[PDB]
Homo-oligomer: A and B are copies of this chain.
Amino acid sequence: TPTTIAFQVDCYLWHLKKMLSLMGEVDAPFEDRLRREQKALKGRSMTLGIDIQAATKAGYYKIKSITEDAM
């Protein structure tokens, strides 16, 4: 599903942004955007019935699949 795939990819890329935030590599507006997006992902998670952790894993493999041969 394009909606499910969108969620998985959004979750994984958000996970990357969160990790960079916790590493202190980024500034405050990036951190504000981060927390905004997370609240939005939680809302979407309720509608899709997909756990953010599971979606994050799936999104990692989707991204691995696309960067593998293109880059």
The one of B2, B63, B66 that contacts A27, using a Cβ cutoff of 8 Å: B2
In the complex, which of the residues A9, A24, A71 has the most CB atoms of chain B within 10 Å of its own CB atom? A9
List the number of copies, as a whole number.
2
Interface pair B20/A5, CB less than 8 Å apart? yes
Interface size on A, as a range, is 20 to 34
Main secondary structure of the interface of A (DSSP, over half): helix
Chain B residue contacts of A71, Cβ below 8 A = 60
A16 within 8 A of B: yes
A-side residues, CB < 8 A to B, are 1-3, 5-6, 9-10, 13, 16-17, 19-20, 23-27, 29-30, 60, 62-63, 66-67, 70-71
